[PDB]
Symmetry: D2
Subunit: 288 residues, 4 copies
């Protein structure tokens, strides 16, 4: 489709507008379809957790004020608490930098049965990491050539994500594609609305100088890491209502692929359970 990228070297960011709304032009229709999706997401979550077969990472990667937290909140607040974690990837700590860049990411992968939301991800290491060439200023072995760091990261990311797939963990990778002007509108709202002032930071503003280089880094990453098993989704982010609709559709269709079910217990277990049932009935004279 128009938003799913599932092969390498097949992505042109200029062809993906930030304000496309072609799947559903009517805002109230989209709001309602979102609510239908959310109810199904809930139901699938309950089955996933009962079965304990397969985990799911829901990863959002986007510029500041593109919509990550608000999309996470509005679309996934319907989930029950059981088996859910949300992990924001912030500027790495000293300990995290002292380790390898996937250490903190792999640590947060969900168990089978569980859902982990990533607010940012391992892709920071080929986004800000690439744009600011952070590897040039970081401690590493003399034998690491700076000229292969980024290409090795794309290979290693491909390999890590495939390893996860092969071990019953799927990843949903969502790029919330916001325009520079819409970012500005949202920033002004963070400044002007006292309830939002806590969400604005110096680094939010400072990234704007590098806007075009970030766009290029996104394009490069999506070209390097989109596969059938681990696709990228490029979601127009200029309208929150439409972005929340599209994300709800991606999550529900991925859960449908996983097809979780309540487990069937073995015939032996069922016979033992029937024994316990009789004992319970006998204890209360069959008045239960």
């Amino acid at each position: 489709n128009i938003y799913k990228i599932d092969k390498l070297n097949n992505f042109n960011l200029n062809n993906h507008k930030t304000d496309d709304y072609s799947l559903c032009k009517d805002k109230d229709t989209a709001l309602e379809l979102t609510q239908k999706n959310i109810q199904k997401i809930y139901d699938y979550q309950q089955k996933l957790y009962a079965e304990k077969k397969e985990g799911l990472i829901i990863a959002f990667q986007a510029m500041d004020a593109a919509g990550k937290d608000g999309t996470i909140r509005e679309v996934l607040k319907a989930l029950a608490p059981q088996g859910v974690h949300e992990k924001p990837f912030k500027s790495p700590s000293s300990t995290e930098l002292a380790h390898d860049y996937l250490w903190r990411v792999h640590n947060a992968v969900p168990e089978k049965g569980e859902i982990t939301i990533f607010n940012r991800s391992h892709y920071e290491d080929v986004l800000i990491g690439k744009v600011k060439e952070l590897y040039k200023f970081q401690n590493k072995a003399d034998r690491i050539d700076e000229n292969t760091v980024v290409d090795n990261r794309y290979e290693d990311i491909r390999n890590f994500e495939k390893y996860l797939y092969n071990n019953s963990v799927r990843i949903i990778k969502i790029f919330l594609n916001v325009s520079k002007k819409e970012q500005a509108e949202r920033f002004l709202s963070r400044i002007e609305e006292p309830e939002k002032n806590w969400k604005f930071s110096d680094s939010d503003f400072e990234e704007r100088v590098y806007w075009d280089k970030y766009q290029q880094a996104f394009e490069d990453a999506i070209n390097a890491t989109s596969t059938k098993d681990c696709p990228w989704y490029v979601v127009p982010a200029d309208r929150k209502w439409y972005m929340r609709y599209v994300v709800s559709e991606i999550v529900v269709k991925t859960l449908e692929e996983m097809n979780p079910k309540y487990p069937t217990v073995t015939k032996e277990t069922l016979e033992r359970f029937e024994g316990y049932r009789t004992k319970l009935l006998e204890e209360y004279n069959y008045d239960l």
Copy 2:
């Protein structure tokens, strides 16, 4: 303070707390509606708590099997947004956990300031099944550890841990879901009979019933030993799901109300810099942005 809130030591008589009390709200449909209103208020409080990053909250459920821990967590606390929430079931300790001290695994799960951690079971298991089955007698420990004071030292150390947490901006809500033995049996029958619930039944669920009375006494002992003003116990009648969900929603709302979270007010320095950012943004687009202020 309340019929259900125990907030002083040595003040608890479990036989005076009926499993089927419903005195705060006798009408099921009233309670269902009020619970939904509570859940919205919990969400609103959570958003402020998360913004402020001042105080963390543990919501701990301790109860017998099929008392309603998971059901209550799901129906009431699905209100929360995902941000800043963890749910931690305490299961039979692993080798590594047993090789450590018993609070190690529990302290590791404590929330950050601004965050909420739900405990499905807790450190109290170490004075419930730990006491009932005298598990300390079969566990590795130093020769100098006096077996006769293990449990009393646990109540003291738990009091001190919870007070330490309170002194460091972490509150704990301790909820005992007080179910009857018969209602437990009814819920077990449903786990057996309903295919969608069969995964939730275990041999150990049935086998704990032999120790029912000993567990009741251990609960009473623990609540007598650890209820304080800062770290009270709530004894919630559990025989009606609708009522238990109402009461739990009320406890959570009222605790968040006491925490009184607010969206942070930024310093004068931040405000000055924000004015500069606003102007730069406006100038970049020739003042063609949505502003709530005049130009």
Copy 3:
């Protein structure tokens, strides 16, 4: 007990000289005895690890260049790798500060059978934390009284260390008491010796302006947290050879009190193991080296 403080409100730092050497006046004797102690520490560690009954924290708290790392290295390199962790407590990360201050410390406590060395400790929260009043700049609930933060930390620390003791974890708390001048000598060496340059920092120099306040904070902490179960050891730190001797003595004598032993198997296990012995011998037609030659 000239160096051991084991009761509350019983410590006067001015009575503890940084250059006392009264337990062993002869350097070469002390060097030899330290080597003997190190071998004994290794032997005890092997028994401790086998038994899996009791854990040990060895915690060093001192100013920069007092000799924490060098003493850890020279004395505790005796240990086999199995069951050992060394945990330096640095400036807390965002995550650590978002948690409660004992979170990161409790996470690092050893398992039964194991030894964790703390280079700095939870006491930083009543040392630099008290000196610089760091609690005034940190996120916390409005109901927290800033004026009782430090006193509550001494009570909570006492309680945490007692809790550990009650759960089979001992703590050795060592204050390496160096003089301001000897610190200056050691700083000069870090500057002048190329292989040591990496160990010097601006913050090392800058702490010297707060020397007296740090001394007072150490005194306050030792007054507030010394007990029979969790004593403090105030070790003169102006001579490395003597400091290493004294530390080796404290560690040997603490392990001796723990009295670790290789475990004895149960009668049931012994019978099974005797059966396995027979099977092994029969498999090789008795051509195995047995200490019961038949």
Copy 4:
């Protein structure tokens, strides 16, 4: 030597690697002394590695019970200072570890740059006992996971994980302590007969011997599938402890030599500030 080092795929014949080869050093006392020389050098390199904070080292021992893992770790690596050292035994996975993917618990234990982590057993357990006992057939996983390719996918994913670590300044030394069944028996008899060693013996130690030949096959298969230039396997004869300790000391010291750690040299600006501090210190004590 290239007699013990395997550094290419599909190049390994276990039957040609005898458990009692001693061809690098036939004289026990010469070997014991060379071991002590190596140990002094390992210590020196450890100090520099820790100062530099550029590269981490995993020293992984994978071997049957009583092959010599603990005793080799102890005798060869007790000379290490405690700073920057961890030892991690991989035991039977806990419920939480099984709920996660099999590399989660392994990757969590990887050392920081500057640090050394000893692995007693490793991620290779998942293609040793995991293969021998077909543990994946009894473990929760997604329905889409092909049981017939689980082990092959594990070799691929292990190759990719180890390469990823190498690309991120973490080396791994993989040591197979190749002990004979008879020598295992001799060592087990000692564990039974010496009361101080009884704690080291278990029913599972004795029970593994029924699968001896399947384990030998699994080792051969693993070493064929995972030996590379950057992440070689070392097949160390384990029937004589003195010789095994010598060879392990040689592998570790030569790997550290390759890492070539150095005490850092500070920048000219920092040096000038330090010279400022030196003067102030000298002035404070009147040049004493």
